[PDB]
Amino acid sequence: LVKCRGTSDCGRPCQQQTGAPNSKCINRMCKCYGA
């Protein structure tokens, strides 16, 4: 798991912490709650 692909997967692990509006992706890596 090292190629962004943050189309919804990263959103699951991170959602546990944050809520629904938790998703963000950058070449370097996946991210969440950044808006």
Domain ranges of the chain: 1-35
- Which has the closest alpha carbon to 22: 3, 13, 1, 5? 13
Identify residue 6 by its one-letter amino acid code: G
Q: How many of the other CB atoms lie within 10 Å of CB of 32?
A: 19
C-beta separation of 22 from 15 below 8 A: yes
- Taking the CA atoms of residue 1, residue 28, residue 26 and residue 11 in that order, the dihedral angle to the nearest 10 degrees is 30
Alpha carbon of 7 to those of 18, 21, 28, 34: distances in Å? 17, 13, 15, 15
- CA within 13 Å, CB half, 15: 9
Q: How many of the other CB atoms lie within 10 Å of CB of 30?
A: 20
Experiment used for this model? NMR
Q: Which residues contact 12 (CB under 8 A, 6 or more apart)?
A: none
Measured CA to CA, the distance from residue 33 to residue 35 in angstroms comes to: 6
